[PDB]
């Protein structure tokens, strides 16, 4: 098969990202995969004359202890051309959506020769016993934003016979994964996904066929979705029958901040109860005019803000906060104070022991949700020190993609998203 010409965005060179250290498990697992991929022509050995590099690490195969090979093509995707030469709004409505790893198809299509040098990565050595063993891809690499677009002409041909016989099944693709939504239940959705697994096999598309693990963690449950039951976490005011002047100060501050999102929130009647200079622990009864204002504020906070629509020309931003006792709250937005979704997570892996294991699970959860609702990956504002995150996050990663993220340190003045 011929090769599609691939170029970079105008005025930008290739990626030059240093390789981070890897454990012995992953180094032994990466050299075993790279040799099998070099004997099969998928990758070819190179040297220091290639001035580009991108980080490579290892994750776990689905429902298995065998190691996988994952490349962090984030900086390369930012520099490759925009492949242009539709997102299903009903995918987020299906009773069930299953994710299928179809990245094996990419290892069959040869890659543009004048582009393979931008795909270089380096394998390190324990204690630097050996210098860097470099390679480059000859085929479409998994996790590269150009692979699904180049293969989009081929996949649409494969799925069209299946989509005809099943015209009520949405199929959306993002990177190496297929998002198959259906309205079936009582085992019917499970059987139809295996029909698609048999269809892809007849065209030569291998998919993970391992039996779902019965021992925790049930990581395979992350690939089984039910978007029709997803809820939003609204701003909630404290519910009390007796208030101290300290409770009302907290309440006024939370309302003053909430007014930046909801314009109809008023404070006058509640702040009128803090006119004197009384002790913080003193109970004050509420006037009939203040209770009416609190009721009208609760009524406003029931429904999300209107007049906020998704803009495909803009990027998505995801902010996450740690609430404690395994609780995490998040908001997705394109413009400030105009959230498209507010959610909450709880009872995640490491809820009793590991904050980093919780945060990585939440980041993958939010990203999977944003892929189903809008077809984009958000840019994350992670509440963690930079060195803490980069030390540990690869040990808990499971997706074939990696979203962009930055780090923040915003102490909680008020607890807005969780009361």
């Amino acid at each position, epitope marked *: 098969i011929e090769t599609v010409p691939v170029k970079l965005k105008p005025g930008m060179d290739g990626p030059k990202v240093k390789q981070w250290p890897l454990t012995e498990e992953k180094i032994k697992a990466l050299v075993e995969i790279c040799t099998e991929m070099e004997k099969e022509g998928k990758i070819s050995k190179i040297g220091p004359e290639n001035p580009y590099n991108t980080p490579v690490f290892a994750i776990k195969k689905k429902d298995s202890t065998k190691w996988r090979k994952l490349v962090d093509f984030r900086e390369l995707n930012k520099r490759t051309q925009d492949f242009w030469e539709p997102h299903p709004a009903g995918l987020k409505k299906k009773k069930s959506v299953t994710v299928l790893d179809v990245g094996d198809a990419y290892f069959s299509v040869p890659l543009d020769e004048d582009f393979r040098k931008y795909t270089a990565f380096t394998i390190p050595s324990i204690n630097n016993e050996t210098p860097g063993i470099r390679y480059q891809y000859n085929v479409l690499p998994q996790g590269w934003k150009g692979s699904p677009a180049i293969f989009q002409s081929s996949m649409t041909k494969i799925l069209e016979p299946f989509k005809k016989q099943n015209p009520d099944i949405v199929i959306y693709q993002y990177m190496d994964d297929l998002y198959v939504g259906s309205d079936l239940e009582i085992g019917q959705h499970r059987t139809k996904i295996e029909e698609l697994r048999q269809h892809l096999l007849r065209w030569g598309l291998t998919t993970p066929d391992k039996k779902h693990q*019965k*021992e925790p963690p049930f990581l395979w449950m992350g690939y089984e979705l039910h978007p029709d039951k997803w809820t939003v976490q609204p701003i909630v005011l404290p519910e009390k029958d007796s208030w101290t002047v300290n409770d009302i100060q907290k309440l006024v501050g939370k309302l003053n901040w909430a007014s930046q999102i909801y314009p109809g929130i008023k404070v006058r009647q509640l702040s009128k109860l803090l006119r004197g200079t009384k002790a913080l622990t003193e109970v004050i009864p509420l006037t009939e005019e203040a209770e009416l204002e609190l009721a009208e504020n609760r009524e406003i906070l029931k429904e999300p803000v209107h007049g906020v629509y998704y803009d495909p020309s803009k990027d998505l931003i995801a902010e996450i906060q740690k609430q404690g006792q395994g609780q995490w709250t998040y908001q997705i937005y394109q413009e400030p104070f105009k959230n498209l979704k507010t959610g909450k997570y709880a009872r995640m892996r490491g809820a009793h022991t590991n904050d980093v294991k919780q945060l990585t699970e939440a980041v993958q959860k939010i990203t999977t949700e944003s892929i189903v609702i809008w077809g984009k990956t958000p840019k994350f504002k992670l509440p963690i020190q930079k060195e803490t995150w980069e030390t540990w996050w690869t040990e808990y990663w499971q997706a074939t993609w990696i979203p962009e993220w930055e780090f923040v340190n915003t102490p909680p003045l008020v607890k807005l998203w969780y009361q």
Partner: antibody
Amino acid sequence: MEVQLVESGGGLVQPGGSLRLSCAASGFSLSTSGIGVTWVRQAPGKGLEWLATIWWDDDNRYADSVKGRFTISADTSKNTAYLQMNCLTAEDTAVYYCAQSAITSVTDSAMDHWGQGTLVTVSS
Amino acid sequence: GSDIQMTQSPSSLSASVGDRVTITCRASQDISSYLNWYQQKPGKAPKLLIYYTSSLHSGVPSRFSGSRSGTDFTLTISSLQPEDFATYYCQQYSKFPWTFGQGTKVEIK
């Protein structure tokens, strides 16, 4: 319909005899992905002992106390579960419950909606 | 011999209404946080009380709590009630075969 599990088939059995217990499931289908049934016995006055678990994909998990003797099955047509207990001894005299096993999330899996329990006694 | 062993302590205890009761259950190997607690009142079938170490099952009052310190799991009852006098079993599911604790009986005295 609420979730219900009703065991049946217990009774007195002679040494070296066998017995099949039924667990009729109402309120949920055994064909549902992530759903399984689980058998647990409790000798009179003693504690709970886990026995077997069949899952939605015909996957079976047995205890060492019953390996080679007990066989767990499921008929999705009648939406009931079975436990064929061969080679019974007096150490198998107990009340036998069937419970609903379900992998509900990445982290949650337990036993809920326990049946009333049927009694099995072995002579000696 | 590779089966995981769940050991509860104590095997029985006596408390009056309003007391605070703690029941521990130690696992013979690391089972992460994958533990379920069960309540079995006399003559009745077991009820799922707590799942995944600390999550209360639907319908369970706020006096019940579950915690974990490595392999030392703890079920606590802040204000013992007449409805709470039962036998409590811990159960692991980190690995098959699943195993139960020997049980802790909470009596009145």
